[PDB]
Design an enzyme around this catalytic site. Structure first.
Site, PDB file in Angstrom:
ATOM      1  N   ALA A  65       0.851  -1.180   0.000  1.00 53.73           N
ATOM      2  CA  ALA A  65       0.000   0.000   0.000  1.00 53.73           C
ATOM      3  C   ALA A  65       0.889   1.233   0.000  1.00 53.73           C
ATOM      4  O   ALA A  65       1.174   1.816   1.046  1.00 53.73           O
ATOM      5  CB  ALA A  65      -0.925  -0.018   1.207  1.00 53.73           C
ATOM      6  N   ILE A  66       1.334   1.607  -1.196  1.00 52.14           N
ATOM      7  CA  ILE A  66       2.300   2.679  -1.383  1.00 52.14           C
ATOM      8  C   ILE A  66       1.568   3.895  -1.939  1.00 52.14           C
ATOM      9  O   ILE A  66       0.686   3.764  -2.789  1.00 52.14           O
ATOM     10  CB  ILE A  66       3.443   2.239  -2.342  1.00 52.14           C
ATOM     11  N   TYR A  69      -2.428   4.268  -2.562  1.00 54.00           N
ATOM     12  CA  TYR A  69      -3.049   2.951  -2.412  1.00 54.00           C
ATOM     13  C   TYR A  69      -3.356   2.555  -0.963  1.00 54.00           C
ATOM     14  O   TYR A  69      -3.994   1.525  -0.721  1.00 54.00           O
ATOM     15  CB  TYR A  69      -2.240   1.869  -3.143  1.00 54.00           C
ATOM     16  N   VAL A 155      -3.619  -4.876  -3.500  1.00 50.13           N
ATOM     17  CA  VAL A 155      -4.406  -4.261  -2.430  1.00 50.13           C
ATOM     18  C   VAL A 155      -5.749  -3.687  -2.887  1.00 50.13           C
ATOM     19  O   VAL A 155      -6.670  -3.567  -2.073  1.00 50.13           O
ATOM     20  CB  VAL A 155      -3.604  -3.164  -1.676  1.00 50.13           C
ATOM     21  N   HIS A 176      -5.370 -15.646 -14.856  1.00 49.11           N
ATOM     22  CA  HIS A 176      -5.766 -14.260 -15.100  1.00 49.11           C
ATOM     23  C   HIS A 176      -7.196 -14.217 -15.668  1.00 49.11           C
ATOM     24  O   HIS A 176      -7.520 -14.953 -16.612  1.00 49.11           O
ATOM     25  CB  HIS A 176      -4.769 -13.615 -16.071  1.00 49.11           C
ATOM     26  N   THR A 188      -0.578 -12.158 -23.476  1.00 49.25           N
ATOM     27  CA  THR A 188       0.279 -10.968 -23.516  1.00 49.25           C
ATOM     28  C   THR A 188       1.598 -11.204 -22.769  1.00 49.25           C
ATOM     29  O   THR A 188       2.029 -10.369 -21.976  1.00 49.25           O
ATOM     30  CB  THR A 188      -0.438  -9.725 -22.951  1.00 49.25           C
ATOM     31  N   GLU A 246       4.479  -9.127 -13.682  1.00 50.65           N
ATOM     32  CA  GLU A 246       3.612 -10.191 -14.208  1.00 50.65           C
ATOM     33  C   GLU A 246       4.232 -10.971 -15.376  1.00 50.65           C
ATOM     34  O   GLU A 246       4.048 -12.188 -15.477  1.00 50.65           O
ATOM     35  CB  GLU A 246       2.243  -9.624 -14.588  1.00 50.65           C
TER      36      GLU A 246
END
Ligand SMILES: O=C(NC[C@H]1O[C@@H](n2ccc(=O)[nH]c2=O)[C@H](O)[C@@H]1O)c1cccc(CO[C@H]2O[C@H](CO)[C@H](O)[C@H](O)[C@H]2O)n1
Ligand SMILES: O=C(NC[C@H]1O[C@@H](n2ccc(=O)[nH]c2=O)[C@H](O)[C@@H]1O)c1cccc(CO[C@H]2O[C@H](CO)[C@H](O)[C@H](O)[C@H]2O)n1
Ligand SMILES: CCCCCCCCO[C@@H]1O[C@H](CO)[C@H](O)[C@H](O)[C@H]1O[C@@H]1O[C@@H](C)[C@@H](O)[C@@H](O)[C@@H]1O
Ligand SMILES: CCCCCCCCO[C@@H]1O[C@H](CO)[C@H](O)[C@H](O)[C@H]1O[C@@H]1O[C@@H](C)[C@@H](O)[C@@H](O)[C@@H]1O
Ligand SMILES: [Mn+2]
Ligand SMILES: [Mn+2]
EC number: 2.4.1.40
Lengths: 289, 289
Positions: A65-66, A69, A155, A176, A188, A246
């Site tokens: 949580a930066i 966020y 988050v 996904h 992707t 990812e």
């Protein structure tokens, strides 16, 4: 504890498994390397809860949580309390640049929360990518001594339904939600050979979501350090993977097959994708814009 | 070796798994505790062979040939050479009261055979049951130092098709060919509460065959010693389980769930049961009377 002497299960009364009836007729429930794919209807949670409680399993849940966020933490933690590993020992690890902005969420018995102060990166791509380094570093700082399994998630999400011990295994990835029905050529993946994350058009099992992975502390350490080291090589070579952490996660899981794969029940966006028939439950979902 | 640092898989070209297509529409391919049930069509053997070869896996195969049963060894071993774990390290362990009656079977590279002299019991029931004690004892004598996995089978059988690394897991049992379609009340479990093997009418997942079980050396040691100790308690109490070692195996696997279950492809009798549509391959079969 994992891999320690296991006591006998008690007598239990439950429906007999049906050898001549598939548990799902609409989806694949086992990978070609014999890893279960976890959908509703594949598991009896009463049996699994017994197995994991008898081992006194502790699950760590990591979340970053930066900057802005931090606003997502209250709903994330509140809903985790209702749905995540209820009845088991849980240790939340909140990584943040603003310790004072972490909401005071009331926790059930046997559940605890630690705030881990880290630096904020300027670019959202680096905030996302450097999760790999930070998770890896903390696998020594405390995770090895404190938890048996680690679950690593985004988050900006909320729990809507049961997320429990059915996910636990040495190494897991999650399908996904945008790509579970896609052919590999449409995935992707990173497609430039100059990147460590490169996967050719004729390779790939699934497209895994960067927003939900985990496993034993040992296997999560291996995954996160491998991805970090691969991202550092890319950076030295002046290239950044198309989907950042990812892309590297997908490369790692292609070459090191997960021992369970979670269905998109476990990672969903209802605003974008609705509620298809294939999903009997929506467990962990994006918070709408 | 098991549970040791794993190298990356090489690039492989194979068909993409189909998330929205069940791998079988006619059978259950995962237990309610998320153990794969191994049928043809559930696994890609090329992926599994890679995973297990990279770990330099050694498989022990135990067989008892006491008294007149030495006559079955030639066909058993010859067919194992064609079908069992080909390409992997194999160590056959032949337990016999007649070392000189063991046939000289020509073995492929990386495969070896040891003859273990044991005492013969008078009753066929005791010969069968005391396999548990003897397997347990040898888990210390040599199995721990020599093999990664143990496969424990009846000798009056032949391999007809592939039996490979798809079966390997910490603990496995096999669906008995006579009962895979039966309801639990019809299972021939021990039903007398006076026996350690007792299982009530409302309990039980499957009826496992005593003729084919295995797993890691550690888990096979646990299973075999537990069954032996349970049989000794029964003997002291003047009771012998209805199906001997098989009754105790079933009790153990009810209380300690196997991590894979093998389909009846792996344990069959064609004379008695024919060749049903549900069986795409007959792998390991009874030798006709
Ligand atoms: O989740 C994201 N990053 C991965 C994780 O990385 C962490 N993170 C990332 C950047 C950051 O500044 N702080 C931070 O803590 C946090 O835990 C995040 O969950 C992320 C990054 C950029 C943009 C978005 C959201 O983009 C889109 O999806 C949303 C889903 O409802 C909304 O639709 C949003 O309008 C749309 O822009 N998420
Ligand atoms: O397999 C049996 N015992 C378990 C294992 O125990 C071992 N064993 C048992 C007794 C023994 O004297 N020596 C010995 O080595 C051997 O490895 C055996 O495979 C066994 C015991 C009694 C009778 C039978 C066979 O009974 C029936 O099944 C056969 C399957 O084709 C034939 O139909 C046979 O005519 C019929 O009696 N098998
Ligand atoms: C052919 C059908 C095309 C339709 C597919 C639509 C889903 C696309 O999804 C994005 O996929 C990217 C990789 O290619 C990244 O994982 C990105 O984070 C993700 O967006 C995230 O997850 C999504 C589910 C949303 O919540 C989005 O708002 C998030 O930013
Ligand atoms: C309702 C349908 C009833 C029809 C079911 C017929 C199979 C019965 O099976 C026997 O089952 C016993 C337990 O209840 C023991 O495991 C025994 O060793 C086994 O016979 C062994 O395995 C068999 C497959 C045969 O090879 C037989 O010759 C062996 O002695
Ligand atoms: Mn997001
Ligand atoms: Mn027999």
């Amino acid at each position: 504890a994992i891999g320690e002497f296991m006591v006998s299960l008690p007598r239990m009364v439950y429906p007999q498994p049906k050898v001549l009836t598939p548990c799902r007729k609409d989806v694949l429930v086992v990978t070609p390397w014999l890893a279960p794919i976890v959908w509703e209807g594949t598991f009896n949670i009463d049996i699994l809860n017994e197995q994991f409680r008898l081992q006194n399993t502790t699950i760590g849940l990591t979340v970053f949580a930066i900057k802005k966020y931090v606003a997502f933490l209250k709903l994330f933690l509140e809903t985790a309390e209702k749905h995540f590993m209820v009845g088991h020992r849980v240790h939340y690890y909140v990584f943040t640049d603003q310790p004072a902005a972490v909401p005071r969420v009331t926790l059930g018995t046997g559940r605890q929360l630690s705030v881990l102060e880290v630096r904020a990166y300027k670019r959202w791509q680096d905030v996302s990518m450097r999760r790999m380094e930070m998770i890896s570093d903390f696998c020594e700082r405390r995770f090895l001594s404190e938890v048996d399994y680690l679950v690593c998630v985004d988050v900006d999400m909320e729990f809507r339904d049961h997320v429990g011990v059915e996910i636990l295994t040495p190494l897991f990835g999650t399908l996904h939600p945008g790509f579970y029905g896609s052919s590999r050529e449409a995935f992707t993946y990173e497609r430039r050979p100059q990147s460590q994350a490169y996967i050719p058009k004729d390779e790939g099992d699934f497209y895994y979501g960067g927003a939900f992975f985990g496993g034993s502390v040992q296997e999560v350490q291996r995954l996160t350090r491998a991805c970090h080291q691969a991202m550092m090589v890319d950076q030295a070579n002046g290239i950044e993977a198309v989907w950042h952490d990812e892309s590297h996660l997908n490369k790692y899981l292609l070459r090191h097959k997960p021992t369970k794969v979670l269905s998109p029940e476990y990672l969903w966006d209802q605003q974008l994708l609705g509620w298809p028939a294939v999903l009997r439950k929506l467990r962990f979902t994006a918070v709408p814009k």
